[PDB]
Amino acid sequence: KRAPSYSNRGMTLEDDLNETNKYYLTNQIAVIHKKPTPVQIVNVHYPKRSAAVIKEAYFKQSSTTNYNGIYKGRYIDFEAKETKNKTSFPLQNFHDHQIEHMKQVKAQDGICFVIISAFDQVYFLEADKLFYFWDRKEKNGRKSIRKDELEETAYPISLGYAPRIDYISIIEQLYFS
Amino acid sequence: PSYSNRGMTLEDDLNETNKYYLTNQIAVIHKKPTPVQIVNVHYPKRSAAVIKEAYFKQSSTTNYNGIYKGRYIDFEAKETKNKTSFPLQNFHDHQIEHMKQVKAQDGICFVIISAFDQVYFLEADKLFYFWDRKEKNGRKSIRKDELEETAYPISLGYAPRIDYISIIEQLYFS
DNA sequence: ACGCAATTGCGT
DNA sequence: ACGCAATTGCGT
DNA sequence: CGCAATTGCGT
DNA sequence: ACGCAATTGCG
């Protein structure tokens, strides 16, 4: 975990949203965790007593959205994606299943959405809109959302110290009067 | 090899009950996968990139969850064979803390154990209790019969095997 | 898997 | 007709 | 992250 | 000294 580097604009990294979650944790505001990345652990070894060191394992494509949890007894689910492209946000770094799921997750009523970090700016795009840009892609046409319609389609978030990323104050400002 | 015991694992049995649930739009539940910290990933051009060394960590979050009917659902699934009693040695402190936070936030928070050839849907407060007594250097287990009213026997069926959705359907919101 | 170099192709 | 925004893809 | 072994409580 | 209960050890 000794990573001397290297800057993004910005994850950043688990530090950015992650710290926000811990904070939300220890102030009894919400329980939101990042579902961990699903490996298929083909081969493990057990050297020198404990502990184990998987010698061969492969990456699986997830099926669920990146983050989930509880706020005010409601379900929270969301993906977070960031881009350095100064012009637009690549819709292509979303993937099939994630969207299938956001769909199913909004099936029963949930707060399902997307946090986007691009244009030196963290944005909160509701899942609705995202679904528009998705089948805009899906019929045919633009595989990205240009800024002037990301800013036009999404709510900007305020990035401070402390909650670093304060998405709950939007989910509050919007789904809870 | 996916099941190296005498009694069925409860791994598949539950995460199949979940598939049914999903496919029929009854509700959305998914097991959080096991956390591992990757260390090295060799990446051939053809072969999919092989993670060649990696280590387990141990997540706090109680390892099932999702949505049902607009309300955040959560639980755990331990499973014990011994007909003796059921050992709290399975659940850890962090898990308990977590699902403490959860019910501290209007969460619905089962505990599912398939002990004694039966599937026990165990409400949270009751588990807390056992863990509490236990924390007072008391009974480090739940004896075979004391859960038997502390907990509900889930309705083990065929379409959805260890149907618990309707237990939670019954308590809340009716 | 991802950044990020390569490459496409829209736009005017 | 050519630039520079959108995409593809190849490389640790 | 388990089932085979260990030991201790307690008729 | 067993059922039954708790606790090392590495497959």
Residue numbers in the entry:
A (entry chain A): 23 to 199
B (entry chain C): 26 to 199
Q: What sentences appear in the manuscript?
A:
HJ resolvases are specific nucleases which nick the four arms of an HJ at the end of the recombination process.
Therefore to gain insights into RecU DNA interactions, we crystallized an inactive mutant RecUD88N in complex with a palindromic 12 bp DNA. The asymmetric unit (ASU) of the crystal structure presented here consists of four RecU monomers (two dimers) and two dsDNA molecules. The two protein dimers are constituted by chains A plus C and B plus D and the two DNA duplexes are constituted by chains E plus F and G plus H. Each RecU monomer displays an α/β architecture and the structure of the protein is identical to the previous structure of unbound wildtype RecU with no indications at this resolution of any kind of large conformational change. The complete stalk region of RecU is visible in both dimers within the ASU of our complex structure. Duplexes fit along the concave surface of the mushroom cap of each monomer, which also contains the active site pockets. Hence, the DNA binding pocket consists of a mushroom cap of one monomer and a stalk of a dimerizing partner. However, even at the low resolution, two hydrogen bonds are observed in all four monomers of the ASU: between the N atom of K165 and O1P of the nucleotide backbone; and between the OG atom of S166 and O2P of the nucleotide backbone.
